[PDB]
């Protein structure tokens, strides 16, 4: 069907520029316009601009001078670029497509791209086991000291999803994030099944698979 | 630009009940309004277009009405997976603008937490820092107290809490409390306990361990 896949999240220094690629499938860029929307703590949902089928662009008024949208029809790619980012430009950026070629009811969305504007440095996390000690055992992974958000965590390469809780990251006094991911399983499976949290911090391309066993 | 005002900001109902979301525009926009659902870690999902028109694949319990300045999104029988924020969008006047959203929570019966405690791993202790995690699992309502004690000394200021959003299946919350201390401090003590207070417990539950078993 119709899909929009955006490039990965990342850090951007203040006064610097942002680049996001939206790759579409299930339709042609020559038939549909592609919109850009962001979502920030300061202003919530915000329509930024659009590139139409024929290449014309419209930019929302407070962005006309620092926003540039381009595309490559043959490669089904839309390119979003924004200049001179500041802290309140920290937000999740989506590309989106409407039901009809001319309209603004956004029926298809990219998965979003979380952009963090900060002078700090990217750092990958360390992954530590939370080891199991009514026949239900809890276990998890401690994903500690990374920057910036986000980090993705799954269990057994996607095969274990029931009973999983991945808590929201919290910012430590160090300026680094930390979170835990937990799952409850039958304690009788601890000697039979292997349990692995799959951690990926794309801003640093740090990918860690942590095996969690009873101590 | 058109200002879209959504009310209330929070909405708490029980399953099977009908619920209504409000969206008011700063001037008439006819019926040029769209509604969206955003689940936890999800992208917005189009529910209604032009005030009242259905969308493919959207359950029939979602409907919308209104015209002019006052618009309503309705769910006649709330389900658990309806937990989300809901947004309205206008497009009668350029540029298209969005409301600030209304959060929909679900009520359910009281559920006491299951409490687990994890010592720091020997791996982390190599790094010179110790993390003690106390997990409160699948409880309701959200309010809960976590009290840390090291050798009966009350810990204050050196723990952080994180709380999941409501679960889409059983409407419960889960909470993690992480006590962070230096390895030197951690080695200078023995008894590590988190005490958990919650409406669903007749008395507080304490999970503890002694460093080195």
């Amino acid at each position: 069907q119709v899909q929009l896949k955006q490039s990965g999240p990342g850090l951007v220094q203040p006064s610097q520029s942002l680049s996001i690629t939206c790759t579409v499938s299930g339709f042609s860029l020559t038939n549909y316009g592609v919109h850009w929307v962001r979502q920030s703590p300061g202003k919530g949902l915000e329509w930024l601009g659009v590139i139409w089928s024929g290449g014309n662009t419209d930019y929302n008024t407070p962005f006309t001078s620092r926003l540039s949208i381009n595309k490559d029809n043959s490669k089904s790619q839309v390119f979003f670029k924004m200049n001179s980012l500041q802290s309140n430009d920290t937000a999740i950026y989506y590309c989106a497509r409407a039901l009809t070629y001319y309209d603004y009811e956004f029926a298809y969305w990219g998965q979003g791209t979380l952009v963090t504007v900060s002078a700090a440095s990217t750092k990958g996390p360390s992954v530590f086991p939370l080891a199991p000690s009514g026949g239900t055992a809890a276990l998890g992974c401690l994903v500690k000291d990374y920057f910036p958000e986000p980090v993705t965590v799954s269990w057994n390469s996607g095969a274990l999803t029931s009973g999983v809780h991945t808590f929201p990251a919290v910012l430590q006094s160090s300026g680094l994030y930390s979170l835990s991911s937990v799952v409850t399983v039958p304690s009788s499976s601890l000697g039979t099944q292997t349990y692995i949290c799959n951690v990926n911090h794309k801003p640093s391309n740090t990918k860690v698979d942590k095996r969690v066993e009873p101590k | 630009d058109i200002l879209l005002t959504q009310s209330p900001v929070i909405l708490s109902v029980s399953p099977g009940e009908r619920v209504s979301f409000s969206c008011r525009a700063s001037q008439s926009i006819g019926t040029n309004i769209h509604w969206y659902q955003q689940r936890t870690n999800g992208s917005p999902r189009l529910l209604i277009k032009y005030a009242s028109e259905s969308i493919s694949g959207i359950p029939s319990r979602f409907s919308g009405s209104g015209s002019g300045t006052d618009f309503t999104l309705s769910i006649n029988s709330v389900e658990s997976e309806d937990i989300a924020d809901y947004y309205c969008q206008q497009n009668n006047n350029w540029p298209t603008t969005f409301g600030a959203g209304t959060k929909l929570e679900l009520k359910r019966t009281v559920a006491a937490p299951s409490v687990f405690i994890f010592p720091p791993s020997d791996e982390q202790l190599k790094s010179g820092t110790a993390s003690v995690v106390c997990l409160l699992n699948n409880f309701y309502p959200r309010e809960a107290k976590v009290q840390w004690k090291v050798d009966n000394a009350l810990q204050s200021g050196n723990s952080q809490e994180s709380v999941t959003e409501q679960d889409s299946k059983d409407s419960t919350y889960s909470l993690s409390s992480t006590l962070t201390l230096s390895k030197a401090d951690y080695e200078k003590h023995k008894v590590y306990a988190c005490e958990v207070t919650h409406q669903g417990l007749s008395s507080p539950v304490t999970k503890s361990f002694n460093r080195g078993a």
Partner: peptide, 12 residues
């Protein structure tokens, strides 16, 4: 009432 980038949800 404010949107949180960590959870993609409204918090307060």
């Amino acid at each position: 009432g404010q949107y949180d980038l960590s959870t993609r949800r409204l918090k307060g």
